[PDB]
Ligand SMILES: NC(=O)C1=CN([C@@H]2O[C@H](COP(=O)(O)OP(=O)(O)OC[C@H]3O[C@@H](n4cnc5c(N)ncnc54)[C@H](OP(=O)(O)O)[C@@H]3O)[C@@H](O)[C@H]2O)C=CC1
């Protein structure tokens with residue numbers, strides 16, 4: 373497989389370039405950045421190669437600028453981790469419009485060149501995923517965003533630590549916005565397949581304070597160390613692996629809705645999806661508790677309105 | 685296994701804390717830094733936990749200041765990546781004197797609380813390895829440095845790209861100083877076990893140009909992105925894995941010499957070693973070509989001079 377990382381010089385871009393190169397099915401990877409960062413990428417390329425030697429792995433790594441995106445041709449997946457840094461002289465909405473412009477230009481320019489899957493990380497990821505879908509003109513299965521896949525991982529850790537199990541023994545998910553209107557699914561949270569509400573220590577599990585910590589986790593990591601890095605990069609590789617080996621797993625990604633859940637359409641948002649070699653193979657309308665379903669509809673309304681306000 | 689990382693807030697310390705935690709045999713890892721960096725470590729801990737969730741791994745990560753190193757007790761391996769930044773008109777000897785004070789105090793305070801292996805990354809790594817050994821009073825099998833293990837990895841890449849093979853299909857090593865007196869061993873360089881001088885395309889292999897690039901590889905990465913990160917971190921985990929599973933491999937590390945090679949002793953430097961659960965289980969005196977051996981003796985004298993100037 374060939375993958376391209378647009379934004380490879382950033383915090384997430386550099387870490388995900390390293391982890392992707394290690395993967396045995398990833399034979400070619402393009403690190404792509406603005407011209408001013410090419411020398412950073414050359415050092416990143418040497419450092420990653422050294423790491424492959426120490427870890428028994430291999431890859432063909434190429435560095436390119438984003439002036440000529442024809443190099444993306446042949447990429448099965450193109451990961452977009454580009455984004456404008458937050459500063460004080462810009463509002464949240466101003467920053468979203470700047471990123472929307474970046475995402476649109478990349479989506480339009482990549483689509484002139486080839487058909488690839490667009491894996492969007494740029495925030496606000498649900499809005500940017502929808503923007504890239506519309507501007508690229510790609511099929512809906514080919515454009516998706518990390519979304520609440522990452523928040524699900526933060527929930528998973530806290531559950532595992534409370535119940536005293538290997539982190540991998542927990543499976544849980546959060547749907548809706550990658551944001552404060554996210555909807556954690558206690559109805560789909562299990563340890564070794566056992567719903568956590570059937571475990572003896574569940575009665576004292578402060579799950580709402582845990583959810584609050586998940587809602588606040590990204591901003592806390594930004595405050596403590598500047599920004600999330602290994603978390604998002606590993607979550608990206610997890611999805612890439614599912615696509616490359618056609619695993620068919622029920623995951624959660626920011627995906628385009630086309631009527632599967634209560635006839636809702638015209639939005640990208642965190643939902644249950646089956647992921648395989650064609651990307652988003654289906655959006656899976658699972659049975660939600662009433663509070664979960666109403667909160668998901670609420671998150672959809674909030675995200676649709678964000679999309680309209682960034683476009684305007 | 686329990687591991688402690690001293691200097692975890694730094695560039696290599698952070699990347700290596702992430703890779704160690706992923707390892708299935710590492711159940712507990714202490715991230716240790718100066719008190720002013722603990723907030724960074726708290727965020728690193730959260731970020732690593734998130735990564736473990738995404739990759740099917742697990743660990744118990746604890747954040748501690750270096751004020752009380754009793755938390756190191758029970759660590760099988762303690763990795764020291766703490767070191768000052770080389771600033772302006774600083775010589776290599778200036779660097780070594782500042783970092784030797786850091787390494788001396790860590791080694792003495794750790795030896796007060798427990799017996800552990802000391803895996804030295806702090807530069808100049810051959811000198812800091814010797815300093816940690818003497819100040820800790822540990823047995824020589826317990827103290828070693830990364831040394832030319834990292835340079836060997838850069839050599840491996842260059843060879844693999846010239847001959848067009850998987851990087852892992854190359855095995856090669858560089859002995860001597862982690863520095864510009866390092867000694868590449870073409871006599872111990874092979875692809876699929878085949879000495880590369882027996883391969884048809886070896887005649888056009890620009891050996892000398894490749895060697896010069898390897899010698900400058902660390903400096904080049906500093907120029908382009910500010911410092912190496914993933915290369916060193918992955919080379920560290922590779923050694924920890926050999927120790928944790930008692931693999932018994934012939935690798936290259938900065939280790940204490942005690943007469944194995946031409947009676948040379950009283951120095952730590954990159955040499956062929958057999959690594960296992962006890963750390964450096966032996967220094968292996970392999971057959972060197974005459975020029976490789978003279979270059980190695982030169983490297984030994986240079987490193988010894990640096991050890992004296994720091995004493
Ligand atoms: N959805 C999620 O789970 C998460 C989302 N994110 C988002 O991902 C993005 C990347 O985050 P992070 O890596 O921490 O950010 P960094 O600031 O560390 O990296 C930014 C990257 O974007 C590039 N870039 C910046 N400005 C522009 C521009 N005007 N045009 C093109 N490329 C540009 C940079 O290139 P250069 O070096 O040339 O400046 C660099 O590669 C952000 O939008 C961030 O909000 C991050 C956290 C998690």
Ligand SMILES: NC(=O)C1=CN([C@@H]2O[C@H](COP(=O)(O)OP(=O)(O)OC[C@H]3O[C@@H](n4cnc5c(N)ncnc54)[C@H](OP(=O)(O)O)[C@@H]3O)[C@@H](O)[C@H]2O)C=CC1
Nearest residue numbers: 691692693694695696718721765766767768805806807809
């Ligand atoms: N052997 C090899 O192959 C390589 C060697 N190295 C060496 O490894 C070390 C770490 O490199 P790198 O991570 O890039 O450097 P960084 O500057 O990024 O990190 C240095 C680390 O040392 C700590 N530190 C700095 N000053 C002191 C002090 N006075 N007392 C205690 N701790 C201190 C820092 O903690 P804080 O944040 O609190 O300051 C930080 O954790 C250096 O000595 C470097 O030369 C690096 C490259 C490869």
Ligand code: NA
Nearest residue numbers: 393395398430
């Ligand atoms: Na690979």
Ligand code: NA
Nearest residue numbers: 705707710742
């Ligand atoms: Na582990």
